[PDB]
């Protein structure tokens, strides 16, 4: 019960890390491309 | 019980990914700024 609530909050945590990781990958990709284009 | 111990260890895992993600965001930000300044 509280155990299920933990797991749900962990799932919210995870989805936040997924969000950050996709932000970072797009941003690093845009930098690599910029350097390549230069 | 072992179930709770799993969730705790998963929580430690998560906090480690949060640490890495903040390191990476500061570092990518410093690179973007460097390129902008150049």
């Amino acid at each position: 019960n509280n155990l299920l609530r933990a797991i749900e909050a962990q799932q919210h945590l995870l989805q936040l890390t997924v969000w950050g990781i996709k932000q970072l990958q797009a941003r690093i990709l845009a930098v690599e491309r910029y350097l390549k284009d230069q | 019980n072992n179930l709770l111990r799993a969730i705790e260890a998963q929580q430690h895992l998560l906090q480690l990914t949060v640490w890495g993600i903040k390191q990476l965001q500061a570092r990518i930000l410093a690179v973007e700024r460097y390129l902008k300044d150049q």
């Binding site: 509280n2 933990a6 909050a9 919210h12 945590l13 | -």
Partner: peptide, 24 residues
């Protein structure tokens, strides 16, 4: 969402989880 809102949501849910771990 911004990285400031992200930082805060992270902390909010880290706190919730830690209280759910003690309650259990």
């Amino acid at each position: 969402m911004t990285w400031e809102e992200w930082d805060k949501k992270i902390e909010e849910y880290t706190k919730k989880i830690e209280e759910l771990i003690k309650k259990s």
